[PDB]
Design a protein around this ligand. Sequence first.
Ligand SMILES: O=C(O)c1[nH]c(=O)[nH]c(=O)c1F
Ligand SMILES: O=C(O)c1[nH]c(=O)[nH]c(=O)c1F
Ligand SMILES: [Zn+2]
Ligand SMILES: [Zn+2]
Ligand SMILES: [Zn+2]
Ligand SMILES: [Zn+2]
Lengths: 363, 363
Amino acid sequence: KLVRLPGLIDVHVHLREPGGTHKEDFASGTAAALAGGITMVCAMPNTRPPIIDAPALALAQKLAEAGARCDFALFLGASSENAGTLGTVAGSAAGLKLYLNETFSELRLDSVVQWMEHFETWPSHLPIVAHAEQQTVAAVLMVAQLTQRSVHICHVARKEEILLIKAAKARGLPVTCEVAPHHLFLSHDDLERLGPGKGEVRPELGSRQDVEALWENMAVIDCFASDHAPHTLEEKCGSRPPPGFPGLETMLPLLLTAVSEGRLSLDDLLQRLHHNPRRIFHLPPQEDTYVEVDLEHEWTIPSHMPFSKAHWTPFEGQKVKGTVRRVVLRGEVAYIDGQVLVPPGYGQDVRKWPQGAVPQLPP
Amino acid sequence: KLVRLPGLIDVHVHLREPGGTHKEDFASGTAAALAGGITMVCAMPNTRPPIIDAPALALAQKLAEAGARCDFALFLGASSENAGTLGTVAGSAAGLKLYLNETFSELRLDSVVQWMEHFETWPSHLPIVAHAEQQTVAAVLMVAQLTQRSVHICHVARKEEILLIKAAKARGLPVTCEVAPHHLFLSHDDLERLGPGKGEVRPELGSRQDVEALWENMAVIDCFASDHAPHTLEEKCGSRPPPGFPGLETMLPLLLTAVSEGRLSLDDLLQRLHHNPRRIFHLPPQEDTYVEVDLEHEWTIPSHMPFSKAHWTPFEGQKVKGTVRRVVLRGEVAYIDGQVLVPPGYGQDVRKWPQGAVPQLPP
Ligand SMILES: O=C(O)c1[nH]c(=O)[nH]c(=O)c1F
Ligand SMILES: O=C(O)c1[nH]c(=O)[nH]c(=O)c1F
Ligand SMILES: [Zn+2]
Ligand SMILES: [Zn+2]
Ligand SMILES: [Zn+2]
Ligand SMILES: [Zn+2]
């Protein structure tokens, strides 16, 4: 028998359009999403041009409307120059993304004062998410407290980080977080197989103790999100390997395997890939939308999944139990057993739906 | 006419004994202190052995009692192994020092969870100070809030850091800080003259804008403290230059010059080199103790000051106006015009004085 799930949401993907379309584009990346049982994605702003101003957002919105096969929201990115300039378009974005560790120059913040300025100027009712590793988690939490608002921490990867967040939650601080599949299912032990190029990712793969700590502290994890970060094999295996793994097509199969093994429950999964993404990011329901999965079928992850242009995967060789069989999106069959059946452009910007605007107090 | 000042206190010095006595020892370092108008010093724990346990503290206490010419308190240092082990000796120390950025392996903390453990286990009534640069300031402030206590930030060197602290103080958070003379009187502009070896210090020399920001935000600075960090010229000019400047003998002359120029008042100076050190660290008064300075005498800083074994100074060539003429410590003439007149061992551990114990609620 098939199990019917609601439309799953991935709040952290890199779809590379504009400007990196050999790595992925809206059409290929959203095909990958649907194949992974994901019907709504939130796309990060570190494209070329990066989504750091109104014109870049407008361009990305049209590229997404024309290419996306599933529904989406687009993040804006914080820069050293745009604090206090995004007020008119802020509500149209998934949220604001801060890159607080490594990134390219356009998104680099050189001072915590710049973080403060963003927390002070970004509308208080809208989401802020951060790439914030190790001590940077504590630092951005401090900025959030000084400015008396919430923050969501992207891809938590370490015992250190999840325990800090746990302590913050115990103090009633408004912080949420997500964890990516590679930080639950891969570790340092896998670097021998992957090699130093393929294995490059930020946050880096953790120790066995890091992975164990994330599982032990599942209660502290609000969301799963792939951090789908496609690069071609040539790039990953070259002289200056970019960090990141593709992950849309493998996330749900990996997690379903863990459900099958009793490592977490189906509800635990659905809180983290549906309900909590909805509530943290104020994402609307999708009418007539559901995913049918098969929990019995055992298979081995191949050297590349069918859809991502990355055309490789760090999970090659892992045995999984769990398969996406069918996806229906807003009343149309979007995916069946390896075939995507909705065209580029079927997808819509959920922030334009009346139910997808973030509620706020009147002026 | 001479101006009579109270006995000045430097809460941040490295006296290198035990184990680095070619760089400085208690006798030479405290001679330097007296020559700089300083009658009480707090010595950092990054010696060899480092002061991270009771036996090392006991050794350092005896070396200081035998060698110090001025009065002192000794810091304990946080390590990855000693949280929850220092309770019996904590009250005998100046406070607990956390090295949160670069340091040697024995004092390295690999996780913010280790910082949390120290804040939770160190007695709540006793001082904690941190080497915490840039975002690390925000991170350690977060740990302090989670554990609902105060923290003092060592050598604030950047616009970013002083503005973060300013914002924290505006929110009523219990944080204090100190600034070292090199971050007020030297900058990037001086690296050409100093060279890359001599110029090595942590925190590094800041931009002109950093220096300007510290002066503009003098109200936010609770203490001046030298971070006297002596290394020999051979070491500074060698293949792996250690970071740090000697500074006991130049701190007061530099600051008196600024007082003379109306950059801050004499009271501003005395709050920062006497009253605030006393109150933050619960340091006792010194009976019959005072410093007489001459504010008229103009001189140029030489290539080395008379007492520090570092035998060099990054302030060489700077013109100053202000000289220490005489120091009286506990009723004895300790220094006159270049001559130290109290022997090694004259100095005492102020934490052993009845008035130098930190008051606490009964068990
Ligand atoms: O865009 C990427 O490739 C990327 N890859 C990573 O591994 N971490 C990131 O923070 C990131 F932005
Ligand atoms: O002990 C030292 O030499 C030293 N020198 C520095 O410049 N910064 C430090 O944090 C330090 F511990
Ligand atoms: Zn990231
Ligand atoms: Zn990412
Ligand atoms: Zn330091
Ligand atoms: Zn120091």
